[PDB]
């Protein structure tokens, strides 16, 4: 115990257990077939309709090259998903499986293969200052 | 993982049965309880290391 | 039927604009531009549809 | 009565579904609230 001179006021991020509710809503997915009544009249029909790139189109290749005009090739979703995949390939795989529907991801956000420090490791080398022998830093590495 | 798979499987239902019944309420309560419990476990492991 | 479907597309476009203003004035933000502050718990909050 | 049902009447009417594709349940509010 003694007179500690300190020179820094920033906080240290603990001691706030907040009971979190608020992520309460039904999640949204990509569906294939939906339903409609097409006019509002005495004429009315219950019609199902299936979406385009889901289950009806295929990926590009040179053997399937030009296009068939009858095929449901949804150009907007095709281009958007192409640029999305180009941007998508940069992130590593845990950050890819967080962008999936079902929750197969690790709950703790920093990954094992990227973080240099051990998660919840207990070892920390503190050298006591004693006049005499030599003081040193970074005994972990 | 089991709970989120139940959520997507039960959400893939057809039109005359897409109902916000008591099963979906309990599944949402499960998701909330699981995430609170595992975050509490994270903080407890931090304190036990300290 | 045409007018009801056209209403659905109009409210979709309106919600697109409500996203655009947030993303525009969020991504023009630079380091200590105006009115930035410490907030806390937002990195804890992840709500997603 | 044939004219007691029209498109302008059952377009108003509420027991028929006329559903959309959104599943979110919006809330209404009262002016004193």
């Amino acid at each position: 115990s003694g007179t500690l001179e300190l020179y820094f006021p920033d906080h240290l991020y603990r001691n706030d257990y907040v009971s979190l509710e608020g992520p309460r809503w039904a999640p949204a997915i990509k569906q294939a077939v939906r339903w409609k009544f097409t006019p509002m009249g005495r004429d009315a029909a219950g019609q199902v309709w299936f979406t385009g790139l889901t289950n009806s189109e295929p990926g590009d290749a040179w053997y399937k090259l030009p296009r068939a005009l009858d095929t449901p090739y949804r150009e907007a979703h095709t281009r958007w998903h192409g640029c999305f995949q180009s941007r998508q390939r940069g992130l590593p795989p845990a950050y890819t499986q967080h962008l999936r529907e079902m929750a197969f991801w690790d709950p703790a956000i920093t990954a094992q293969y990227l973080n240099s420090g051990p998660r919840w490791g207990c070892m920390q080398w503190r050298d006591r200052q004693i006049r005499g022998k030599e003081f040193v830093v970074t005994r972990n590495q | 993982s089991i709970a989120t798979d139940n959520l997507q499987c039960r959400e893939r239902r057809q039109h005359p049965d897409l109902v916000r019944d008591y099963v979906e309420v309990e599944l949402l309560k499960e998701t909330e309880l699981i995430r609170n419990i595992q975050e509490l476990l994270k903080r407890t492991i931090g304190q036990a290391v300290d | 039927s045409d007018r009801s479907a056209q209403h659905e597309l109009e409210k979709d476009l309106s919600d697109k604009q409500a996203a655009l203003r947030i993303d525009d004035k969020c991504q023009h933000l630079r380091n200590t531009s105006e009115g930035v502050s410490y907030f806390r718990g937002v990195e804890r909050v992840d709500a997603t549809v | 009565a044939p004219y007691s049902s029209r498109s302008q009447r059952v377009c108003e009417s509420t027991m028929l579904p006329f559903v959309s594709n959104r599943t979110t349940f919006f809330t209404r509010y009262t002016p004193d609230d």
Binding site: - | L18, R20 | - | E12, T14, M15, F25, T27
Partner: peptide
């Protein structure tokens, strides 16, 4: 009006409702 009675049935402070006046309704 049955439409006004049904929407008055559905309204509430914390009650989800699927009916939509002069438009399509929710699939759920």
């Amino acid at each position: 009006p049955r439409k006004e009675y049904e929407v008055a049935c559905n309204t509430g402070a914390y009650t989800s409702s699927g009916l939509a006046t002069a438009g399509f309704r929710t699939a759920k």
